[PDB]
Write a protein that binds this ligand. Sequence first.
Ligand code: HEM
Ligand SMILES: O=N[O-]
Ligand SMILES: O=N[O-]
Ligand SMILES: O=N[O-]
Length: 151
Amino acid sequence: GLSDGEWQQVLNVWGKVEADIAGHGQEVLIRLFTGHPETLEKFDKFKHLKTEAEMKASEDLKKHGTVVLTALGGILKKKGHHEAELKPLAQSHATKHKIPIKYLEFISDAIIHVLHSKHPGDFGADAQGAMTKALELFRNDIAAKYKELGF
Ligand code: HEM
Ligand SMILES: O=N[O-]
Ligand SMILES: O=N[O-]
Ligand SMILES: O=N[O-]
C-alpha cells in the first residue's frame, strides 16, 4: 500500500483538483476521449461529440467530469480503506457499462497528464510518485472485483 507520507502527498495534490473539480473533470475526459476514441463509444450520451470543440462546449461532459472526480476523491480520502466505495463502481463498470480495465489505465494516465498540464512545475516528482501509487491501488482493487465477475 501507500505510506502515511505518500497518502499525505496524494491528498495534498487532490486539493488542486478540488479548487476546480469541473475543469479538471472536463480535461481528464477530453484527454481520455481524444487519446482513445474507442472510450467515447462506451458513452451513449457523448458519442455525438464529433470534435474536441464540441467536447469543450458540452456542459453535460463537464457535469460527468464532476461526478467522476467526486467519486474518485471520496475513494482517495479513505486511504486504501475503500472496499465499500469501490465495490459498486467495480460492479457498475464491469457489468453495466462494460468498461475494460485497460480503460481505467487510460483514465489514470489522463489524470496524471492533466495534473501536469494544469499545474506545470507544481506537480513534483514525489507527488507524481504518490498519486501514481494511489491510482494503481484503485486500479488493482477494481481489477480484483473484475476477476471475481469474470470480466
Ligand atoms: C476514476 C475512474 C472512474 C470513476 C471514479 C468513475 C465513476 C463513475 C460514476 C460515479 C458513475 C455514475 C454512477 C455509476 O454508474 O456507477 C460513472 C458512470 C459511467 N462511467 Fe465511469 N468512472 C471511471 C472510469 C470510467 C471509464 C474509464 C469509462 C469508459 C472509458 C467509464 C464509463 C462510464 C459510463 C459509460 C457511465 C454511465 C454514463 C451515463 O450514461 O450516465 N467510467 N462513472
Ligand atoms: O510515512 N512517511 O513516510
Ligand atoms: O467517466 N467515467 O465515468
Ligand atoms: O438507467 N440506468 O442507468
